[PDB]
Amino acid sequence: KIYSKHTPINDLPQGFSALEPLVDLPIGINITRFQTLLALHRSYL
Amino acid sequence: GTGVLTESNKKFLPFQQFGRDIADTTDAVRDPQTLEILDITPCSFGGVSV
Ligand SMILES: *[C@@H]1O[C@H](CO)[C@@H](O)[C@H](O)[C@H]1NC(C)=O
User: Fold this and answer.
1) φ and ψ of A41, to 5 deg
2) Distance between CA atoms of residues B43 and B38, nearest Å
3) Residue B2 · residue B40 · CB < 8 Å
4) β-strand pairing of B4-7 with A20-23
5) Which of B23, B48, A30 minimizes the C-alpha distance to B40?
6) Based on C-alpha coordinates, what's the Rg of chain B?
7) Rounded to the nearest whole angstrom, what is the distance from the C-alpha of residue B37 to the centroid of ligand 1?
8) Strand partners, A21
9) Probe ligand 1: pick from B17, B30, B31, B33, max atoms within 8 Å of CB?
């Protein structure tokens, strides 16, 4: 299950912004570890 | 279920299907075939006193 929210903000901010349900995927696998993917640009120099 | 299906003004979110009252009983339904919200209200009933 992936839940998401985009909040316009001026530490983490105060107040409430509930995350809406985005997708429920019928995967059925074992998940114990995770890692974030970043994008890197080639230099060309 | 047995009830009257009426038009609703409840702003359901796209994920949301069912609707519930304080009793956690179905109060609205979103149809798969046509994506519209039908409010469910129990039909009229009462006690008869002679
Ligand atoms: C058939 O159902 C799908 C989803 O349940 C819906 O998107 C589609 O509009 C329906 N077909 C017609 C002709 O309404």
Assistant:
1) -100, 145
2) 15
3) no
4) unpaired
5) B23
6) 13
7) 14
8) A3
9) B33
